[PDB]
Design an enzyme around this catalytic site. Structure first.
Site, PDB file in Angstrom:
ATOM      1  N   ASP A 245      15.833   9.990  -6.351  1.00  0.00           N
ATOM      2  CA  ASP A 245      15.384   9.168  -5.013  1.00  0.00           C
ATOM      3  C   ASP A 245      16.299   7.763  -4.961  1.00  0.00           C
ATOM      4  OD1 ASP A 245      14.136   8.919  -2.707  1.00  0.00           O
ATOM      5  OD2 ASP A 245      12.438   7.975  -3.310  1.00  0.00           O
TER       6      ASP A 245
ATOM      7  N   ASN B 196       0.738  -1.179   0.117  1.00  0.00           N
ATOM      8  CA  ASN B 196       0.290   0.030  -0.129  1.00  0.00           C
ATOM      9  C   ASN B 196       0.642   1.270   0.032  1.00  0.00           C
ATOM     10  OD1 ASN B 196       0.422   0.181   3.036  1.00  0.00           O
ATOM     11  ND2 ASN B 196      -0.862  -1.539   2.848  1.00  0.00           N
TER      12      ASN B 196
ATOM     13  N   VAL C  65       1.125  -0.274  -5.343  1.00  0.00           N
ATOM     14  CA  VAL C  65       2.093  -0.755  -6.354  1.00  0.00           C
ATOM     15  C   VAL C  65       1.344  -2.357  -6.749  1.00  0.00           C
ATOM     16  CG1 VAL C  65       4.383  -1.844  -6.909  1.00  0.00           C
ATOM     17  CG2 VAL C  65       4.313  -0.010  -5.599  1.00  0.00           C
TER      18      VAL C  65
END
Ligand SMILES: c1ccc(-c2cc3c(Nc4ccncc4)ncnn3c2)cc1
Ligand code: NA
Lengths: 296, 286
Positions: free
Chosen positions: A138, A20, A24
């Site tokens: 990221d 969650n 995905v």
């Protein structure tokens, strides 16, 4: 198509959720049955225009073995008035992340030559992104994936336009600060948080500490406190003195505070710790084993 | 205090219906009490070793401090075993959604000044209950202020009351670390600032600094003067209430009790009518 906004019907479909969190899914290509990871978010009609703008800003770059391939963006419409859905599709990697790897290991620490091998794969993926004028933004253990063949791949859900960070009421979140370079944090000395391709190299260095210790520096700190400390503290260091001279030097190589004086991806790929890997083959084997015994 | 071991499996007791929103940590479902069909919101959080104590705390605070009409009531807690267990945090379902939702579904993204006075007062009563128990909510914003189908107002989410940084737009200046404030020292009055921003959100559809990057907002909030409403239409009372929530230096910001005595909060003659208007607005959006 990577410049369109089509309905995923007949090209992709969802099969089951993975986590969650963004949400995905484990998905598949309709016309070929190839597995793919699909990020699903709810978007307003106002945001859909925003992503049209960002599709214009996209940069193109070919496949590359150290990047989980980004297959494109799709929108699955809902009845008039209701919020639609954005799909971001990417190559599937079944051995999990590097964070899982370090957690699923005694003492929460990887062998130094594992760190060398993994770090180099990250760097090669980043070299490909940077030479095509794209920042990843990221880099961390969670965003570096292993396949069921000990292949190391960076997560790409469209890093070029950052579509998975830009809409869906999660784009107003500051997020986790531990892998952030000093320059992306606004603070008294740096009022405008500049992002650079070299920001990834700082995060790469943090990811190396993460592999070595199980957690990024300052993990014991409240995230707001860490965000404050990162631009202020001297560069972080490995706790233990057990590590080789080459490893410390690589870490120091990545974690140059001032990004203007931080080396490029190309320079770091030539660092002796990354460049000289005599046990590479055996390490690729060692990782294969670890992935297999974990599956049982 | 609760112990995660004793918790039962939810099977035959609660069932999930559909994802209805998010939490600080954990997805929020419209859930259902199997035996009675009665609705409940269920927070589904994966129990990892790192976030294991953060979960434990959210149970304890919700359990002990949710006995007030302006706090969404704790029902119970469950674990659905898998080896990454799920914990189900079950509480009162607030059907009408959030305040943020309400404003964005209203024409011109603004609420009538007397809707704002009622809603802000309900927020302040819930906050007073927490503060008198020595609890600081720490994440007051339109997304955590909910409405029941009967236009009742309820506070949710004790997530940050006890690794990710959330939205900054409702943060008080004093909770943001900087050179002259290295330890981000703050008290219960942090929530009053956030209540001010929430009122501005009800008035304009978005918090101040909404057009800024969240990281840029974090930098600006401690440097900027108190935010002000854009329009000159609002009453003298409303301006003064906003001014009172948003005193820059928390040292001379009024207490929760003081703000409850603010005329804008205290003097509400059309209260009765407002609850009806609100109830109607909820029904016309369903
Ligand atoms: C439309 C959208 C959201 C809701 C909703 C969300 C919640 C909630 N959310 C949270 C609870 C705890 N922590 C964070 C969020 N709690 C209790 N009721 N509720 C209703 C209703 C309609
Ligand atoms: Na209650």
């Amino acid at each position: 198509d990577l410049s369109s906004l089509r309905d995923p019907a007949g090209i992709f479909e969802l099969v089951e959720v993975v986590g969650n969190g963004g949400q995905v899914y484990k998905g598949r290509h309709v016309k070929t049955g190839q597995l793919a990871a699909i990020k699903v978010m709810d978007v307003t009609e106002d945001e859909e225009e925003e992503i049209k703008l960002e599709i214009n800003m996209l940069k193109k770059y070919s496949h590359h073995r150290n990047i989980a391939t980004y297959y494109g963006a799709f929108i699955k419409k809902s009845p008039p008035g209701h919020d639609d859905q954005l799909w971001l599709v990417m190559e599937f990697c079944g051995a999990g992340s590097i964070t899982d790897l370090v957690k699923n290991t005694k003492g929460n620490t990887l062998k130094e030559d594992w760190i060398a091998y993994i770090s180099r794969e990250i760097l090669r993926g980043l070299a490909h992104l940077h030479i095509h004028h794209v920042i990843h933004r990221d880099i961390k253990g969670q965003n570096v994936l292993l396949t069921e063949n000990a292949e190391v791949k960076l997560v790409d859900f469209g890093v070029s336009a950052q579509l998975d960070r830009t809409v869906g009421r999660r784009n107003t979140f500051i997020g986790t600060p531990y892998w952030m370079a000093p320059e992306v944090i606004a603070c008294d000395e740096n009022p405008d948080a500049t992002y650079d391709y070299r920001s990834d190299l700082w995060s790469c260095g943090i990811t190396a500490i993460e592999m070595a210790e199980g957690a990024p520096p300052l993990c014991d700190m409240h995230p707001m406190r860490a965000l404050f400390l990162i631009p202020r503290n001297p560069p972080p260091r490995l706790k233990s003195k057990k590590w080789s001279k080459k490893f410390f030097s690589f870490i120091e190589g990545c974690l140059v505070k001032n990004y203007m004086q931080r080396p490029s991806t190309e320079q770091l790929l030539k660092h002796p710790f990354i460049r000289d890997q005599p046990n590479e083959r055996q390490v690729r084997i060692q990782l294969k084993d670890h992935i297999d015994r974990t599956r049982k």
